[PDB]
From TrEMBL, chains A, B:
GO terms for biological process: positive regulation of DNA-templated transcription. One of its GO terms (cellular component) is protein-DNA complex. It comes from Aquifex aeolicus (strain VF5). The keyword Cytoplasm does not apply. The chain holds residues 3 to 164 of 497 of the full protein. This is Transcriptional regulator (NtrC family). GO terms for molecular function: ATP binding; cis-regulatory region sequence-specific DNA binding; DNA-binding transcription activator activity. Keywords: ATP-binding, Coiled coil, DNA-binding, Nucleotide-binding, Transcription, Transcription regulation.
Length: 162, 162
């Protein structure tokens, strides 16, 4: 049951983020458990450097990639600017998908992209972006609720670590 | 749509808890938004002092009531002990309901009790307990996930405020 895995992964992420790991190690471990609990094969967390977004931690294909997004740039960039999420089914062939890392070639037709804002005091400080396969648009919409929760936990972690 | 209100209340709670309100005002405001967004008319957040839980904040019937729970004592005490949630339909008539606060006589048969742990580093530091009417076991299960999420946000907050 997916909901059961979602409950458990949220609990586990809270345990990690209330621990004493470094900022970078904490983010990395969150993405690792998204893989091991929820099957998220590729993901990253990008952090604001003023008006630009830079990948701070990654899992899967984004390892050893140094990428940046400007406000309005692609899916992640729009989420950064507006502080509202984007849920994009079959992203491989979506027009707004900027595929800034050539990851598209590595996706299938079922992969969706969900990008959610990370907010502190209601202001966007980062974005979490994940790729995961879905068979129908309804299951995708449900899954977004969980990724939104994780974005919020990350917002509290950003506050915690100043 | 309920899912939409749940998403919005989680965002709002994160905004409150990453702000600068006092510890007690923050907890109270969380319970206030549970009422305003999700219709939760009676609730409390209890915090661990030594090895006992004490009510730190309350809303509705629990206002101005001093109540302590020991590990294993009643429904809230069991969540405290095991660090796993309880979802009790028709709590008014449940054998494990200690009805410490005598709220029982004010509840209808439709009221459920949902109690979720508040964990820091995986250790139980408190419990959030809510009472709310439901018309079927199914919608109760969905609602439980959201209360669990709020317990996790509160865990982050407890870490934030030392
Ligand atoms: Cl840990
Ligand atoms: Cl009520
Ligand atoms: Cl009880
Ligand atoms: Cl027990």
């Amino acid at each position: 049951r997916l909901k059961l895995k979602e409950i458990n992964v949220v609990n586990e992420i809270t345990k990690i983020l209330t621990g004493d790991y470094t900022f970078e190690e904490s983010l990395k471990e969150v993405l690792k458990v998204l893989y091991s609990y929820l099957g998220v094969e590729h993901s990253f967390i990008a952090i604001r450097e003023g008006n630009t977004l830079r990948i701070a931690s990654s899992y899967g294909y984004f390892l050893n990639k140094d990428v940046a997004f400007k406000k309005g740039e692609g899916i992640t960039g729009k989420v950064f600017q507006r502080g509202i999420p984007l849920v994009i089914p079959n992203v491989k062939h979506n027009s707004a998908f900027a595929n800034k890392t050539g990851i598209g070639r590595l996706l299938t037709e079922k992969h969706a992209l969900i990008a959610a804002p990370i907010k502190v005091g209601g202001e966007v400080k980062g974005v979490i972006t994940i790729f995961k396969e879905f068979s129908d648009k309804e299951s995708l919409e449900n899954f977004y609720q969980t990724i939104n929760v994780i974005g919020n936990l990350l917002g509290m972690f950003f506050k915690l670590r100043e």
